[PDB]
């Protein structure tokens, strides 16, 4: 690769569109995300290989690329870190941890984490 060429392409999705594409991704796994793809700051992510399966059907021109999801978790009040006026940190106990990422996952999607390895 050389510098300043176009290598990767990405988007940012929030809202209803985000929560349904996400579960569309875990359904590929059957709600499975095993051990350590969780990041200690609270967020997590994962990659997949085939996209034709779900969603939209095979298109002849396009190839067989994979990609990766990586969601970020937050609470109302996480926006103040991005505020232009009187920006600030979020506070220690209002932060998220890896521990409450799985609990949020297991409570909401009933997904199975930490296989006994």
């Amino acid at each position: 690769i050389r510098r300043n060429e176009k290598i990767a392409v990405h988007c940012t999705v929030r809202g209803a569109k985000a929560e349904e594409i996400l579960e569309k991704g875990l359904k590929v796994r059957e709600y499975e995300l095993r051990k350590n793809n969780f990041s200690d700051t609270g967020n997590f992510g994962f990659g997949i290989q085939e996209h034709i399966d779900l969603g939209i059907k095979y298109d002849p021109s396009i190839g067989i690329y994979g990609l990766d999801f990586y969601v970020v978790l937050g609470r109302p009040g996480f926006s103040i870190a991005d505020k232009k006026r009187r920006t600030g940190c979020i506070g220690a106990k209002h932060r998220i941890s890896k521990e409450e990422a799985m609990r949020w996952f297991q409570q909401k999607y009933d997904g199975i984490i930490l296989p006994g390895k």
Binding site: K84, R85, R86, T87, G88
Partner: protein
Amino acid sequence: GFVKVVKNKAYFKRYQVKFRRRREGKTDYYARKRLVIQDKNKYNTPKYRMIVRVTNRDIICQIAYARIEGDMIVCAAYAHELPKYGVKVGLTNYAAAYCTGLLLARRLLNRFGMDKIYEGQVEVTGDEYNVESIDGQPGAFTCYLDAGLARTTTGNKVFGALKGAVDGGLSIPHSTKRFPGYDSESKEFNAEVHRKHIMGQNVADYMRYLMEEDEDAYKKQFSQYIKNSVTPDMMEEMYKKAHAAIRENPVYEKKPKKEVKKKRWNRPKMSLAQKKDRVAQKKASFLRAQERA
């Protein structure tokens, strides 16, 4: 015990602390220095700034000039004091921004003995109007606008307080570019959608667009518009009376409330004796606890 700790003792020993108002992110000293500093060969002529601050609930709009000890406010206007006459619902909107700028203009001129001259624009219209001084009369008041950290993009409430002020009689230098009526592509100023936003037609049509679409969205969005029964109509003449009553009596007054007590709502810092005693009994409890085993 694997990665170097960044905020170590050396980091703090050498760290330089920014200015306090910069740390809280309430002031940019790059623009303020350009905006505050008077030319040296004037020596006392105060550079007046029209400070406008938009808040989630209110609109702060004051006029000041800076000294060594601090900035001196000559007079200020507030959107929360608009309900004292005319408008009672719809604060922190573009129309409310226009009135509080107009209120700031009129109350300063009256306090200045200069209200009878330079009436401004008693009739409200969206065109360009900048006050001009009149010979043989006290010169027109001139001041500049302190936008602050707010983005100065076309159609910003801070620029509403500008047109509101200049309509009241301040000679604030301003182009007609950052008003809602300006079409970026055509480089023209419509000057009628500007007055539609000024007097609230911008939310009036939206509010008259909302009943036929829904009621509980109408309820959950314009809830305080339901109470006091402010309809889509009759929101014009009230602004007129709001503009009219601004001219009639823009002066401000207080509420003397001396019936208070000395209830301290916090805790005073513990003295040295309390600290030394506390660690002693913290130590004393520790030796006791281990001795029990």
